């Protein structure tokens, strides 16, 4: 009954930014997770609520795949019960998560001499994000008691900042691609 | 105007508690990153705590489990609560607004927090009189030594402010007994030693002590 | 945990020179470093952010550059209102680490110190203690050592030092040292010497006094 | 890594009583917790899985309860084979499974006192360039006791090691030994040596001291 | 269900050793295998895991250094250590995993093998007699013993009067010293009137160095 494109959600030509993470629905296939096992230069591979070795002997109604790109030292924030900039204002995982998180380095593909300014993350926001929520707004952020009136200046800042990836950076500041698999009550081989 | 004003400093024994307040004008504490940092006497800067505009709080390792950071939107104020204090925590504290990669741009005035075994008392003043061994090239140096006082500050002047030339007041030093000491010196031409007036004034506000002591050569 | 190091901890220069201060990291920081200035008795001020950008209001004579593990801050034309301490700061994922601190001072020709000695006063002697105090006046630079010799024998502990800052007029320093004892220890010795070593002196200069005078 | 804790560290209960041991997690792990039992010098055995389900082939007197960040293991009727060490394990975060420090379930008797003895280094050892002072505590219960070494009435640390035997099956008492190792020159540089013992079965701490040359 | 371990031993630092685990009583290829180690001060810790589909998983302090493999034909599990450090000494167990619904658990464990790594030198123990005295005599009973120091490796068996006496003979577990050597002691209580009358010889033995010491312990009149 066909095999869902686990390859295309793992070797896409370009990934999305963390504040605009890309969601793909996977259903009605014979999920052969051998692709995950065969390629293991994985910086992080952690499954919550299910064992990694049992993925082929269990089924769900549908599977969700979320793809984005972050920096290395923020990879630890993609986990339930974790707090931080990315966890609060960019991407939040519920405390009762039942999926897997995969993250691997992409220095060759995403870094560039002089900086890559196509990857953006949200810096200023007023409240924590609800689990599985995305905010793609670009409205000016008010930091004082005077209305911004849609201009940039003191106490009025643009909410997004670019990572600016370049090869001469440290290990922790290099780009890492992250794919999150969410399962809820697709079958294995 | 945009400004930050701090308050809540004083003397606390090693083990008490304190609550420092930072009131802002022109900056909403509920929509910015707020930070508390501190500086020990002649020891550089150090970060203490940070609070986001979502409720998330982060603390330094050396101060974990002892301090708490809170925010009051009604009064628009940032509070730092200190418990289980130690003698190494005496310093000047600052509250600032952080913008992440754009740095901390606005800073407060800074409040002093001093912790010790207390024992507040006044100073002991001694005269340092010129002599033959203190004469060199027509100029002789005299002064007043201040010992065993607590706490800072203290004001030492000469001749009710009539002398402003050649006066050196050195920074205070901690003693093994937890008390302060310093000295104030002045150089005067030798030929005027037997005629000029030498009266040094020491004022300690916390003890409300005022001393006017005459210094004369020893024979 | 990543630490930052300022290489020129102390540095002296004259008005109009060119000065460069370096801050070095351990692993990697990217282009997120902040350069702050602090005058004594006042709150710090922000000079540079993102290692290359100038904060609004900062004079254009400040310029910063760097990426990765080493960063530099350069002042091209010094002014009398530019003598203070400077710090480098970085975030690194919910932490905040500052540098040790680089102090900038004014330079002056070498001036020999003036040495004075003061014995314990009679009132102090009858109060239960005895402090002998040595005074160094109007010298440059700061490097100078003072040694206490009781009965022509070097004494180690019970000594403290206090030094003033740059003079506003002559840009000179001054130092005071104190040796504290009780009645018996002070009286059980006769010769007291304050040996002074400093660059401005061709040979060390020492002054002394006896208990019987 | 999820940090797992347990309480109390040591528990003593008689045969027939009900016993409860608490395990706490640093995060909400739901019902993902297992309880293991280990006898001395034996491989661990699984008691409880899913924080409430009892493994087939395990006596029904064991039970488990709790959820979130607090869980509890309960034994209705203690029996001699239940003298063991119990561990709590989390199965939420994979594959990095994390265990707990463990708790030891002992047996209870009447309070008994630590017979204290001291032993100065032998001359044969002193001829070898090393000296070892021995402090012996015999037939004490419970295990919680303090042994302190003093040289010329001065506190000492970093030069003493303690070894305690397992609970006996006849008198149900323990035994403890403390060895203080020093050099011959350091041994001959002092006159007074003392070993201080503090136990809940003693009204006052007992300090036994000796001087060089006495015996 | 039977699991048996083999390969435990002593290796100098920087070595490389293979431990094998054999299984019987169940189908080997339909279950997952794990390797778990236990120390005396840090409790239980998981070090390796292998599944049905040829996937190998390791923690941080093990990545690169250790390897795991399985042969279904012989029902064998192999784990190989390279670049061993002195902090890896522990007792190792091979366990079988299982799952009920979504919950994972290790349902059967092996006997376990001991692994100690250090700069080893088979060295003979030193025995010292701890004699009794009036200070060591209380209630008509005096305590006397033999101390064993500086031996490697385990064990050092001690018996009193060639096994003819067991009344109150207390032995203590060995302790590791900062010099990489062990130490223990044996004590026994004797009647006050028996001081200097009954013959007491502690027969200390040592297997790897084949050292037998028969020292007499006697009281002091002081």
Describe the overall structure.
Chain A: Residues 123-158 are annotated as: Disordered. Chain A: Disulfide bonds join 4-29, 47-100, 59-187, 148-156. Chain A: Residues 1-189 are annotated as: Receptor-binding domain (RBD). The complex is a heteropentamer of chains A (189), B (219), C (213), D (215) and E (222). Chain B has 219 residues and is mostly beta strands. Chain B is 0% helix and 51% strand. Chain B has no helices and 20 strands. In chain B, strand 13 and strand 14 (139-149) form a beta hairpin. The radius of gyration of chain B is 23 Å and the shape is elongated. Chain C starts with a strand and ends with a strand. In chain C, a hairpin with a 2-residue loop joins strand 14 (144-150) and strand 15 (153-155). Chain C has helices at 122-127, 183-187; strands spanning 5-6, 10-13, 19-24, 34-38, 45-49, 53-54, 62-66, 70-75, 85-90, 97-98, 102-106, 114-118, 129-139, 144-150, 153-155, 159-163, 173-182, 192-198, 205-209. Chain C has two helices and 19 strands. Helices cover 5% and strands 47% of the residues of chain C. Chain D has two domains: 4-106, Immunoglobulin-like; 115-211, Immunoglobulins (Immunoglobulin-like, Sandwich), CATH 2.60.40. The longest helix of chain D has 5 residues, at 184-188. The termini of chain E are far apart. In chain E, the strands form four sheets. In chain E, strands 2, 4, 5, 6, 9, 10 and 11 form a seven-stranded mixed beta sheet that branches. In chain E, strands 12, 13, 15, 16 and 17 form a five-stranded antiparallel beta sheet that branches. Chain E has a four-stranded antiparallel beta sheet with strand order 1-3-8-7, with no helix packed on it. Chain E has two domains: 2-117, Immunoglobulins (Immunoglobulin-like, Sandwich); 126-216, Immunoglobulin-like. Chain E has strands spanning 2-6, 10-11, 16-24, 32-39, 43-50, 56-57, 66-71, 76-82, 90-100, 103-109, 113-117, 126-130, 141-149, 158-160, 170-171, 175-176, 182-191, 201-206, 211-216. At the D-E interface, strand 5, strand 12, strand 13, strand 15 and strand 16 of D face strand 5, strand 10, strand 12, strand 13 and strand 15 of E. Strand 2 (44-48) of chain A pairs antiparallel with strand 10 of chain D, so a sheet runs across the interface.
């Amino acid at each position: 009954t066909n095999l869902c494109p686990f390859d295309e959600v793992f070797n896409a030509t370009r990934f999305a930014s963390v504040y605009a993470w890309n969601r793909k629905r996977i259903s009605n296939c014979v999920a052969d997770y051998s692709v995950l096992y065969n390629f293991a230069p994985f910086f992080a591979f952690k499954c919550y609520g299910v064992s990694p070795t049992k993925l082929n002997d269990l089924c769900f109604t549908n599977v969700y795949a979320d793809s984005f790109v972050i920096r290395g030292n923020e990879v630890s924030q993609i986990a339930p019960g974790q707090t931080g900039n990315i966890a609060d204002y960019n991407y939040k995982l519920p405390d009762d998560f039942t999926g897997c998180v995969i993250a691997w380095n992409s220095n060759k593909l995403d870094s560039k001499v002089g900086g890559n300014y196509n990857y953006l993350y949200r810096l200023f926001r007023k409240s924590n994000l609800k689990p599985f929520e995305r905010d793609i707004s670009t409205e000016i952020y008010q930091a004082g008691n005077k209305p911004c009136n849609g201009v940039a200046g003191f106490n009025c800042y643009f909410p997004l900042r670019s990572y600016g990836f370049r090869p001469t950076y440290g290990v922790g500041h290099q780009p890492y691609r992250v794919v999150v698999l969410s399962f809820e009550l697709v079958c294995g081989p | 105007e945009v400004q930050l004003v701090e308050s809540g400093g004083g003397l606390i024994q090693p083990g008490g508690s304190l609550r420092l307040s930072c009131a802002a004008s022109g900056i909403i504490v509920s929509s910015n990153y707020m930070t508390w940092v501190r500086q020990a006497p002649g020891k550089g800067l150090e970060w203490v705590s940070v609070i986001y505009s979502g409720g998330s709080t982060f603390y330094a390792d050396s101060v974990k489990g002892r301090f708490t950071i809170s925010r009051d939107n009604s009064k628009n104020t940032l509070y730092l609560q200190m418990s289980s204090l130690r003698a190494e925590d005496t310093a000047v504290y600052y509250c600032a607004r952080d913008l992440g990669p754009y740095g901390m741009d606005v800073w407060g005035q800074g409040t002093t927090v001093t912790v010790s075994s207390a024992s507040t008392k006044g100073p002991s003043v001694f005269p340092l009189a010129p002599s033959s061994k203190s004469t060199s090239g027509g100029t002789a140096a005299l002064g007043c030594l201040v010992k065993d006082y607590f706490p800072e500050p203290v004001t030492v002047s000469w001749n009710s402010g009539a002398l402003t030339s050649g006066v050196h007041t050195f920074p205070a030093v901690l003693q093994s007994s937890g008390l302060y000491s310093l000295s104030s010196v002045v150089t005067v031409p030798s030929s005027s030693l037997g005629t000029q007036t030498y009266i040094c004034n020491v004022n300690h506000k916390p003890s409300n002590t005022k001393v006017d002591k005459r210094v004369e050569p020893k024979s | 945990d990543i630490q930052l190091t300022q290489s020129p901890s102390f540095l002296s220069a004259s008005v109009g020179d060119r000065v460069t201060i370096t801050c070095r990291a351990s692993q990697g920081i990217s282009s997120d470093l902040a350069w702050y200035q602090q005058k004594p008795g006042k709150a710090p001020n922000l000079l540079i952010y993102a290692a290359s950008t100038l904060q609004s209001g900062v004079p254009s004579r400040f310029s910063g550059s760097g990426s990765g593990t080493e960063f530099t801050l350069t002042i091209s034309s010094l002014q009398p209102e530019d003598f203070a301490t400077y710090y480098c700061q970085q975030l690194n994922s919910d932490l905040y680490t500052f540098g040790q601190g680089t102090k900038l001072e004014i330079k002056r020709t070498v001036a020999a110190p003036s040495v004075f000695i003061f014995p314990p006063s009679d009132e102090q002697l009858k109060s239960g203690t005895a402090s002998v105090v040595c005074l160094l006046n109007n010298f440059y630079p700061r490097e100078a050592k003072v040694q206490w010799k009781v009965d022509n024998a070097l004494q180690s502990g019970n000594s403290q030092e206090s030094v003033t800052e740059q003079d506003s007029k002559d840009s000179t320093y001054s130092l005071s040292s104190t040796l504290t004892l009780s009645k018996a220890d002070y009286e059980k010795h006769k010769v007291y010497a304050c040996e002074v070593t400093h660059q401005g002196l061709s040979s060390p200069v020492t002054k002394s006094f006896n208990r019987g005078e």
